[PDB]
Amino acid sequence: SMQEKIMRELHVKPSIDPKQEIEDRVNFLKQYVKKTGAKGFVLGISGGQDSTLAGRLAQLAVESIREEGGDAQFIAVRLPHGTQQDEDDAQLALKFIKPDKSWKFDIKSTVSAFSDQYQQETGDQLTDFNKGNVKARTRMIAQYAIGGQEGLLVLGTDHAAEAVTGFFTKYGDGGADLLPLTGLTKRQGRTLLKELGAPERLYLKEPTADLLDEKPQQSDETELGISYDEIDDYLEGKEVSAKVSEALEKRYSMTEHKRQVPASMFDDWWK
Amino acid sequence: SMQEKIMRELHVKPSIDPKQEIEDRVNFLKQYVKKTGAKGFVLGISGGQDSTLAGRLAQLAVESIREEGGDAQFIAVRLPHGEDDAQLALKFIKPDKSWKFDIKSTVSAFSDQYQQETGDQLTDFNKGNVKARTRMIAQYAIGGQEGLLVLGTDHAAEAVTGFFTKYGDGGADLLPLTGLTKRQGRTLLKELGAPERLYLISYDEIDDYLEGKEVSAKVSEALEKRYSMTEHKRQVPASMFDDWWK
Numbered sequence: 001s002m003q004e005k006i007m008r009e010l011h012v013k014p015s016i017d018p019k020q021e022i023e024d025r026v027n028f029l030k031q032y033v034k035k036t037g038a039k040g041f042v043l044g045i046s047g048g049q050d051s052t053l054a055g056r057l058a059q060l061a062v063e064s065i066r067e068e069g070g071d072a073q074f075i076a077v078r079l080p081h082g083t084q085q086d087e088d089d090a091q092l093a094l095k096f097i098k099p100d101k102s103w104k105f106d107i108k109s110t111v112s113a114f115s116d117q118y119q120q121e122t123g124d125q126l127t128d129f130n131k132g133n134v135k136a137r138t139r140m141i142a143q144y145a146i147g148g149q150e151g152l153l154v155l156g157t158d159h160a161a162e163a164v165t166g167f168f169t170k171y172g173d174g175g176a177d178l179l180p181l182t183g184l185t186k187r188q189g190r191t192l193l194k195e196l197g198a199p200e201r202l203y204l205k206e207p208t209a210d211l212l213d214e215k216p217q218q219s220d221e222t223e224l225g226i227s228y229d230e231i232d233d234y235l236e237g238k239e240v241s242a243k244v245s246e247a248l249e250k251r252y253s254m255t256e257h258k259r260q261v262p263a264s265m266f267d268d269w270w271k
Numbered sequence: 272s273m274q275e276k277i278m279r280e281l282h283v284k285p286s287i288d289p290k291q292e293i294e295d296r297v298n299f300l301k302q303y304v305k306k307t308g309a310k311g312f313v314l315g316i317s318g319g320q321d322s323t324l325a326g327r328l329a330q331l332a333v334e335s336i337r338e339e340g341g342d343a344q345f346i347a348v349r350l351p352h353g354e355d356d357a358q359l360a361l362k363f364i365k366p367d368k369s370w371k372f373d374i375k376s377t378v379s380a381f382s383d384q385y386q387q388e389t390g391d392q393l394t395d396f397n398k399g400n401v402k403a404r405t406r407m408i409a410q411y412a413i414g415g416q417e418g419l420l421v422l423g424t425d426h427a428a429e430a431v432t433g434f435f436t437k438y439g440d441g442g443a444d445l446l447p448l449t450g451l452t453k454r455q456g457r458t459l460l461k462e463l464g465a466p467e468r469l470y471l472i473s474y475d476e477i478d479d480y481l482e483g484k485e486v487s488a489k490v491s492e493a494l495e496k497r498y499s500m501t502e503h504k505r506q507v508p509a510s511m512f513d514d515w516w517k
């Protein structure tokens with residue numbers, strides 16, 4: 001079956017123990033660091049549910065390493081494109097995470113430099129969707145530049161509820177070193193935030209990528225055509241309406257190149 | 272044997288048929304674009320050997336598809352930062368379209384903002400990586416605007432060492448040179464009739480290891496170390512459900 005198969009591949013647990021999941025995830029971040037010899041982590045904090053959970057997990061890990069006589073730090077970075085409409089959720093989040101360091105890097109001038117040149121080199125202006133993708137990738141560079149100057153690993157916020165729909169930018173938010181949220185559905189993540197004592201505004205707000213100037217704060221559910229509950233029921237093995245299955249299974253097949261390394265002639269996955 | 276395992280994983284053959292290799296690799300390219308429904312390819316051209324080989328292969332795949340009655344195009348892009356060999360290679364490849372996107376001002380803007388936000392100047396190594404990652408963005412911006420796939424030049428000799436920037440030049444959609452050693456790439460270039468100037472530890476030493484030739488333990492130990500250290504570059508981001516990083 002396709003439902004059962006996507007669950008295996010995305011590493012989804014139909015039932016989880018929040019306390020235990022948190023345990024395993026922080027422990028993973030710890031083991032990863034110790035094996036590599038890195039000095040810590042860096043993550044762009046947007047004020048959305050995903051980076052809030054992932055940031056708090058990195059902070060708890062870093063604190064645990066030091067408690068053990070270890071050396072490690074966490075830099076949380078606000079990556080606004082000028083003024084962020086939901087800037088206040090970003091601050092309410094910094095306040096819950098309590099990162100070792102809070103930096104800021106405005107990506108606007110880099111994105112402008114790029115589009116000006118684009119129009120100068122080609123004669124055509126970048127569509128809003130393409131500039132949106134230039135924004136996510138610029139955030140990736142910002143993150144990798146810091147990690148590269150300070151010796152830290154870049155954290156990814158990828159999880160199952162977006163892994164299934166391939167709802168991320170290849171080499172933008174999809175590019176990172178390690179992923180502490182892998183295999184968690186959207187309703188399960190909220191449940192870890194609840195355990196962690198997160199402020200409700202942070203998990204009650206609508207998920208959005210906010211990469212468009214033409215239509216900012218546009219929710220994911222507007223883009224996708226399904227709601228996260230339907231996606232979650234499916235990831236969790238619940239029997240769902242044929243209309244949800246057909247839909248998810250097609251979007252999942254057409255986004256496999258985002259969950260794989262560059263395609264070679266020796267790879268079957270694409271054949 | 273780590274040598275055999277590495278060879279298996281990097282898909283290297285001890286001996287190749289340059290003519291059959293060209294056909295299989297072009298066929299790979301045609302078939303891939305037909306499966307995805309994309310309109311063609313986009314490759315940043317550097318004058319270097321690897322982008323020259325991949326470019327000619329891209330051009331040949333595009334023409335073949337057009338001869339079968341379909342539609343495809345190849346955009347070769349030079350990406351300077353603010354060229355005689357890039358131009359010589361452009362005459363050998365003969366792409367449909369030759370573009371150019373100077374990365375200088377984007378890299379500069381990022382640099383000044385960085386210094387401005389952090390108080391630090393980006394060191395040489397880190398700024399070189401910003402240049403590789405910015406080239407990636409330019410190629411995907413063109414491909415996304417034109418509905419074209421980004422070709423990468425990663426080959427076996429570049430993969431054992433992990434000598435490339437993760438998401439920089441490593442960021443591509445497909446890789447036509449996979450499994451080829453540097454000297455095998457050279458053979459292909461001569462076969463295609465490329466000018467000597469383009470395909471002309473020890474790089475020939477890395478090839479011996481990859482093609483299964485008896486090498487010294489010195490070369491052997493260095494490479495196997497390098498390879499296990501660069502695994503993160505040939506893998507999708509890590510999670511607790513993976514173990515290659517352990």
Ligand SMILES: Nc1ncnc2c1ncn2[C@@H]1O[C@H](COP(=O)(O)O)[C@@H](O)[C@H]1O
Nearest residue numbers: 044045046048051078079157173208209
């Ligand atoms: N405005 C932003 N400021 C800081 N980080 C961000 C911002 N927008 C996107 N990111 C990063 O990209 C990820 C994607 O968020 P989302 O697109 O809502 O999944 C976040 O979890 C952040 O790590």
Ligand SMILES: [Mg+2]
Nearest residue numbers: 048207208209
């Ligand atoms: Mg968001």
